[PDB]
Amino acid sequence: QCVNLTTRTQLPPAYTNSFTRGVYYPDKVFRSSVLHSTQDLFLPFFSNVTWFHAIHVTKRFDNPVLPFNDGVYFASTEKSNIIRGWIFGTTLDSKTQSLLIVNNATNVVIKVCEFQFCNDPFLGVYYWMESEFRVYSSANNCTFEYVSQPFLMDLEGKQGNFKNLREFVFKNIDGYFKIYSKHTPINLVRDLPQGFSALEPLVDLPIGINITRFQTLLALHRSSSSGWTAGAAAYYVGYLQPRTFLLKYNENGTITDAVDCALDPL
Amino acid sequence: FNGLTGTGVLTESNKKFLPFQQFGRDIADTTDAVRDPQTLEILDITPCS
Ligand SMILES: *[C@@H]1O[C@H](CO)[C@@H](O)[C@H](O)[C@H]1NC(C)=O
Ligand SMILES: *[C@@H]1O[C@H](CO)[C@@H](O)[C@H](O)[C@H]1NC(C)=O
Ligand SMILES: *[C@@H]1O[C@H](CO)[C@@H](O)[C@H](O)[C@H]1NC(C)=O
Ligand SMILES: *[C@@H]1O[C@H](CO)[C@@H](O)[C@H](O)[C@H]1NC(C)=O
Ligand SMILES: *[C@@H]1O[C@H](CO)[C@@H](O)[C@H](O)[C@H]1NC(C)=O
Ligand SMILES: *[C@@H]1O[C@H](CO)[C@@H](O)[C@H](O)[C@H]1NC(C)=O
């Protein structure tokens, strides 16, 4: 149930460089052997992103509620089923709307349905069956519920040293709500590697919420307020900004590389 | 095609057309391809005249 799992040793501030990452597909149009300039909310190249570590090597349940601004770049390059979903709400206490996203590796339960979130909502599999399901208290008013499950968007099944490089982009411009996602196999240790990656608007859901603030739901392992494990998390937050990008399309219709026309005079 | 009104000849094409992409365009921002809503086949559009 909803427990006051504190385990709060405040991690020191962590900042890293996003490099040439966080760029998605602007539109659903096939372009070949051309360069296209688009003005949209992108992640600035070589910008500063926040790297929360929800590890237990240093028991830290890093679940802070951070603002949304214009969109969120989330590089959850973690191990098997650590971070599951995300809560997007101005207050997320059943006073106003608070859209919840949960995948649980089996379904998709995107629901506006303003819930009474008690302190820190989080998931967890008991020492195995998923047990921690009381992320809130009541559904209050349940608006558009999207009871359809496309598939498990986490796409787990790889192991190594943060091998599953998973990236998501959440956007809420006027109406609608876009979730872009790309997965890439890399080794490194924890940081965002070099290269270029972008693949499709994974899931588009028309909601129209205020989405002022946001947080993430963290799965755990029941053996409870302290007897758990964290594995190795890679909580990554980047705030999008309105920039102009010159994307390049090869002859087989995939974006190879892009530049940000605000970084340096070159 | 889903409101994409136009005049021309539809011909089976070799365009890759990744699943999310639906329209396809050339340098002049003119749709020279389409995805058929019934059958997911790519038909490029070559204008007549
Ligand atoms: C974040 O990185 C930028 C350069 O990308 C740097 O100017 C800035 O001081 C950094 N911020 C922090 C808090 O380290
Ligand atoms: C999707 O799977 C989860 C597995 O925990 C289950 O709790 C949930 O009820 C399922 N959704 C539906 C609509 O059956
Ligand atoms: C809940 O939604 C219903 C249906 O639209 C609406 O009439 C009602 O005012 C809302 N609020 C409460 C507190 O029931
Ligand atoms: C709701 O959205 C408006 C318009 O984007 C925003 O400026 C405002 O801060 C939000 N309202 C509250 C009460 O947070
Ligand atoms: C060319 O298209 C083919 C389709 O079979 C694809 O396998 C290949 O990756 C494409 N080339 C590039 C460079 O993406
Ligand atoms: C739509 O229905 C037609 C038959 O009326 C069928 O040939 C076609 O495959 C269907 N399209 C889809 C996307 O299921």
Fill in the DSSP letter of residue A12.
Answer: P
Question: What DSSP assignment string belongs to A46-66?
Answer: T-EEEEE-------B-----E
Q: Which residues pair with B30 in a beta bridge?
A: none
- Asked if the C-beta of A225 comes within 8 angstroms of chain B's C-beta atoms, the answer is no
Q: Ligand 2 mean position to A212 CA, how many Å? A: 28
Cross-chain Cβ contact B18/A31 below 8 Å:
no
**Contacts A–B by Cβ distance under 8 A:** 34
- CATH value of A15-266 in 2.60.120.960, 3.40.50.11860, 3.30.450.20, 2.130.10.10: 2.60.120.960
Deposited experimental method: cryo-EM
Neighbours of A82 (CB within 10 A): 21
User: Which residues does chain B have within 8 Å of residue A254's beta carbon, measured at their own beta carbons?
Assistant: 18
In this structure, the residue with its CA closest to atom 11 of ligand 1 is: A48
Q: Which of A89, A43, A46, A16 is nearest to A235 (CA)?
A: A16
**Cα-based angle A249, A252, A257 (whole degrees, multiple of 5):** 30
Neighbours of A36 (CB within 10 A): 18
Cα A50 vs. chain centroid, distance in angstroms? 13
In this structure, the strands spanning A124-126 and A221-222 are parallel
* Residue A235 near residue A218, CB atoms below 8 Å: no
Q: Is the CB of B39 under 6 A from ligand 5?
A: no
* Chain A contact probe: residue of B21, B41, B42 with most A CBs at under 10 A: B21
Rounded Cα distance, A5 and A26, in Å: 41
Q: Which of B6, B26, B20, B12 is nearest to A33 (CA)?
A: B26
Q: Which of A152, A122, A118 is nearest to A138 (CA)?
A: A118
By the 10 Å C-beta count (0-12 exposed, 13-18 middle, 19+ buried), A242 is classed as exposed
Rounded Cα distance, A70 and A239, in Å: 7
